[PDB]
Amino acid sequence: ECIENYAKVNGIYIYYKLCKAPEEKAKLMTMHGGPGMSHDYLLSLRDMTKEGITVLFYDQFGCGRSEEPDQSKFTIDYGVEEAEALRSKLFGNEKVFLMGSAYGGALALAYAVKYQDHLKGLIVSGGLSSVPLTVKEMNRLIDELPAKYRDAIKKYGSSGSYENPEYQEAVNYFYHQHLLRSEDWPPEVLKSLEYAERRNVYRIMNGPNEFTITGTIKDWDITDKISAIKIPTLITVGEYDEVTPNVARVIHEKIAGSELHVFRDCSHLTMWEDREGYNKLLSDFILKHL
Amino acid sequence: PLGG
Numbered sequence: 001e002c003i004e005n006y007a008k009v010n011g012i013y014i015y016y017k018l019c020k021a022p023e024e025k026a027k028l029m030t031m032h033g034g035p036g037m038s039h040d041y042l043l044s045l046r047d048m049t050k051e052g053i054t055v056l057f058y059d060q061f062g063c064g065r066s067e068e069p070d071q072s073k074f075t076i077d078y079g080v081e082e083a084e085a086l087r088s089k090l091f092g093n094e095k096v097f098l099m100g101s102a103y104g105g106a107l108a109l110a111y112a113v114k115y116q117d118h119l120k121g122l123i124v125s126g127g128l129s130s131v132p133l134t135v136k137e138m139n140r141l142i143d144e145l146p147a148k149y150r151d152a153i154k155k156y157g158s159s160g161s162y163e164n165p166e167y168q169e170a171v172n173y174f175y176h177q178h179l180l181r182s183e184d185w186p187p188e189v190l191k192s193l194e195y196a197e198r199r200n201v202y203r204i205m206n207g208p209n210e211f212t213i214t215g216t217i218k219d220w221d222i223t224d225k226i227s228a229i230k231i232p233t234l235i236t237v238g239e240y241d242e243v244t245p246n247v248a249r250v251i252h253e254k255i256a257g258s259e260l261h262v263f264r265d266c267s268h269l270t271m272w273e274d275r276e277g278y279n280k281l282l283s284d285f286i287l288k289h290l
Numbered sequence: 291p292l293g294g
């Protein structure tokens with residue numbers, strides 16, 4: 001029974017869901033990736049209110065239930081302000097934690113650099129700082145994939161036949177390899193991704209999909225600015241995550257006091273797979289740093 | 291993103 005209210009911010013409206021943890025111990029703000037996705041796939045974090053960890057959720061500009069701003073502010077440097085415009089409006093000046101998944105992590109970082117003065121901790125779940133790099137690394141992945149698909153992707157990809165059947169064939173199978181491990185996609189996620197393939201964001205600011213990043217984010221690469229981040233931090237990732245662990249390192253590398261912890265036998269939506277123990281680590285990370 |  002989380003208060004799913006709405007909030008007008010920067011000319012446009014935004015939806016936000018937070019299940020106020022019984023005994024307020026820490027306020028963790030969530031940051032979904034994509035872009036163009038939604039928070040619906042990060043709901044599993046509910047197991048965190050138990051630890052008296054309050055958890056807020058929110059669909060970024062034009063994402064999910066929230067509305068899109070002028071197409072002019074279709075960037076990451078924008079999403080940032082939002083998070084703040086929102087946060088501030090939510091609890092004025094208070095010690096808050098952040099958790100960006102994938103893109104949201106990148107964002108999370110991006111935000112972390114400027115409005116760092118408003119942070120207690122920063123949890124990243126398979127995030128990134130240099131889009132180009134992430135991409136470069138995915139190819140490798142694709143390459144490793146079995147000829148049949150490794151060949152379909154490059155083929156139809158190098159032509160725009162993204163709709164092509166043989167293409168999707170790889171895609172789904174691929175997703176069941178770097179996005180979601182040994183299993184069946186849960187509701188929370190579905191609706192999320194479904195959103196992306198319906199909103200105007202993931203279409204313009206991202207690209208046809210995850211490994212076909214053609215949107216307004218391929219240039220982005222603030223790997224150097226992250227160095228500036230000095231507040232405590234946490235980074236996670238899977239052995240076979242679409243955003244390969246090799247990316248995570250860098251971050252962990254450019255930022256001290258970080259304790260990169262790769263999840264064994266886990267993919268991207270780690271917060272679901274070994275979710276059972278996933279939360280812990282985060283909570284463990286939070287609590288302690290108080 | 292896709293699915294089944």
Ligand code: PRO
Pocket residue numbers: 033034035101102103104134206209210211213242243
């Ligand atoms: O961040 C995301 O969710 C997608 C997949 C990696 C690049 N963009």
